[model samples]
Target: EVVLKFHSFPPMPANSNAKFVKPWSEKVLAESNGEIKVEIYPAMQLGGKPPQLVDQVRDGVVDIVWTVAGYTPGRFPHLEAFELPFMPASAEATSQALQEYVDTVAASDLKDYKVLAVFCHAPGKIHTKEKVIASAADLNGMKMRGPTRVITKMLEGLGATPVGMPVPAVAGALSKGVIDGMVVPWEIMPSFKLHELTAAHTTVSGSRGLYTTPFLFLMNKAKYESLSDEHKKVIDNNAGLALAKLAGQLWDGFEVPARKLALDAGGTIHSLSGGPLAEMKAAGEGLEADWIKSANDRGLDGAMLVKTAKDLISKYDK
Candidate 1:
């Protein structure tokens, strides 16, 4: 009885479409027997920037949106736990971990909208314009774009000036010298033309992400409440803790090709020394501990959430 419209910031076949928008549309169409049509618009064709997408949904200007929960710092503090650097769990593991933790502990983080699901991308890479960072020292004093606070802290740990900017602006920012480098997944390298502009890529050199950013799929509360139980079930089935697992697995596997593409573009992948890597990881772990305390103060079950996330990451990471 309802036709929902969805908007995604990333173009088709990018992580946004590949992981959620496409699969969700297919699933809904199949489940609804074509009764409930979900029309999708990408590249903000529906109108607005990445950060505003969620607000559009909240304001009922759009029915659905996919956005980063970390765009506004401290607003979603519990969800931001995923930002802790060195999240060794695969993207899939962390995705599931965050969702489950949200359900069991931090439901308050999503009091405004009907949350579809929350997940994150794969291990991030460092793409530079003027110089490819081969080591931590190479990043010293360089202005770098970071998508998440944890990644920003990671850049700071390495002595880089971490500049906060969404991925969509990286291309223009690089050209304008607003930032000299970007930390993102290799899959996005082509989207921002990093392959064309850079000759060097920096990797974590380990199993986990140097830092990962959170992404959200949400719907207006009234719209969700208006759905038939069956339609609601279809949406529910594709969301929450289970969908996290699905999206995360896809993202974890996707980074391989992106890495290869950068390699083919004459980019050399570099790693910081063992000592610096360890130092950075330690700082990240400290951040994790601090985040747990913050979560506790916010009245969430911080200890249980962290323990479950740790266990899930260990499972998928292996």
Candidate 2:
């Protein structure tokens, strides 16, 4: 019998935990016919901080983990291609693209683990306590919290002071005035009570989002290798593109209700368009070139990877 311990940073009711991880766990158990049992530990319940999740799984302290790739900066440089400003089409499409990229391009970065899925949350938006971020200028001098290094750099380019922290800390930072705003998906608002803290929300006008964060679902390499062939097949069946799609759909599904929660709190929603949108896009334009140079320095064909990521997102967007 195989009993796997799954660790995650979000609370149980968070969509990623309830709508996706829980269902995936149940499906694995049912498919294994009692041969495999998964015990889920959400909100870092097993131990350590959110950033420590990758190390925990890698050292086999935990059997499995779902964590943001950007939690550790520059560790997965290639995956940053999909995180560039205006890069993601949607959660479902971008998640599939990220999985394909990980399999074919950035596998070396994740060679330490048996990757279950590579995905992203829905498009991120700007939620501010008082400032209405209708234009890039509105962000000037504001301390804004961002999830990843790439997104933080983009925020810096957009004229805001970027503050780096895990999602779990966002609420406290907002209350303490440690950050004036944050960039995150609508689906995450309800979980963190962002609606109650922020007075204004801003989104861009387009199919592509302002930015997105890449996520990983991983299993310890040794633990996975030790499994029987039958058990291995069960894990494999629940991994890869299929799992990515399910995660994407689940994350996307939560946006409507969460957005409604923000609206009910009387938060102002600003959709950037025309000149303001163009200015915002232009501000972060150099980030791709910077990423390309860094990738090239690391011996990767960064331009090609960027193009491939964009192409794949377009392919699955429909």
Candidate 3:
């Protein structure tokens, strides 16, 4: 009997992983007749920053890890387009699209690990304590958390001071005036106590994340390969695009409760003005070009990958 260990940088009850971790653990333990145990260590208590989580898993420092793909910046350049500003407002749609996109287009980018799932936040948006952001002019001179590179660009485009930090840092930064607001989903607002820190949330109109970062759950390639056929089948039943859909559907489910909570906690959500939203959308159009440049620089097939990812997102964005 072996204890299968997993590590994550968030609490056990947040995001799509929340939907899978507990169920996966329970099912596996039951089927194994308690011969195998599943152990989950969350909140980086196992020691290490988020960006290092993937590498730690690769080296077997952690049996498995959960991390954002953009944490390493351009490391996975092909997938950067998905993280671009103004992508989508639906977590389920983006998750489904991203999974298919990865398989169809950026498969090489993830060859190093065994991908379990990829899910997005409900919708990446701006949350501020004062001055609602309904238009580009509304963001002038404000400080906000910029989750990804493209988001940082958008913050600047809107005249805000872009502060780049991990998700967990937003609460303190908001309280200390290190930032005026943060870019995040209503789902995680309470997790970081952001509901109390910021009173207003702003989202761009239509399709496009206000600058979305991708969350990924992955097992070590060697670890997956080492599993027995029966165990692997159990896992395989829950891996790949299906897992992606499950993860997405779960997060989408969580958003309803979380959003209601935030609203009850006195948070006001402001939908962005059409003009500003359209500008950001236009800007995102060039992401393929920028990603192509990045991929070409890295000797990867940029154009084909971009088209493949676009097609995948289009197919599933509904």
Candidate 4:
């Protein structure tokens, strides 16, 4: 039997791991008629940090990984097109569009490994321990943890000091006073028990939240290439847009219950609206312009990619 090890940074019960990774592994095994054996490890079980997951998969240190594209900044520049402000509306729709975006522009960046799924998390918010980040001014001088470089930039633009960290590090960081708040979706609050650490949750009032991070489920290139044709078929059957849809669907719905958990735990909800919301939108314009230039410098038509990504989202959007 072909035994494959699948690892990621989140716990198994988190919606992404529980709904997409775990089920995808099972589907692959079932489709292979038991010729393939899949072992799942969450919370960095095998070793290494979250940012190193893609490298581990590319180097054959791990068979598979599910990680955020933003974890390794600039390594996957084209994927950042989706992470830009006001780009995503729904997790499922944006995630499905990410597959198309990856296939068209960012594929070369990930040439070392085989991409299994390209997806996105739900809209992220500011989960604060003390300060109530209900507006742009409120973020001024606050120390906030951000998931990716682009989101960090966005946080900076919104007037906050951004600290880079992974999901697993947030709890400890909050308790230690290393950060005043964090940018993440409600879905992960329960898994990390964020409510106990953070007293307030700040959400932007709009069709989409502040920013959503793109994620990748990747496999080792050599491992995928070494699979027999029959075995390859089993892997292929469960990869690509199909898996993206599953990832998106799972993440899209998770925020509902997660929000409940945060509220039940006595977390105060704050919203950014009126003039402050407008100010936040205006602030992202510079970041967007800067990214367009960066994409152009990299020989990519940033404007085209941004348009295509948005178009694809509309196409897949429910």
Using TM-score, give the best candidate's number. Answer: 2
* Every model's TM-score: 0.90, 0.97, 0.92, 0.95
List model 3 lDDT by residue over 144-164, tens digit each: 787777667667766788888
**Regions of candidate 4 where Cα sits further than 4 Å from its true position:** none
Please give the ranking of all candidate structures by TM-score, highest first, separated by commas.
Answer: 2, 4, 3, 1
Query: Candidate 4: global Cα-lDDT?
Result: 0.86
Q: Give one digit per residue, the lDDT tens place, for model 2 in 277-315.
A: 888777667888988888899888999999999999998
Off by over 4 Å in 1: 289-308, 315-318
| Pairwise lDDT winner, candidates 1 and 4 | 4
User: In candidate 3, how many Å is residue 117 off?
Assistant: 1.5
The lDDT, on a scale of 0 to 1, for candidate 1 is 0.77
Please provide, for model 1 over 76-122, each residue's C-alpha lDDT reduced to its tens digit, 9 standing for 90 to 100.
Answer: 77776667777646788878877776776667788788888887888
Error of 3 at 79 (Å): 1.5
Report the lDDT of model 4 for residue 80: 89
Tens digit of lDDT per residue, candidate 4, span 57-107?
999999999898888888888898888877787898888899877877667
Who is ahead in lDDT, 1 or 3? 1
Please, what's the RMSD in Å of model 2?
Answer: 1.1
Model 2 lDDT on a 0 to 1 scale: 0.91
Q: How many residue pairs clash in all the candidates, one count each? A: 1, 0, 6, 0
Q: lDDT rank, highest first?
A: 2, 4, 1, 3
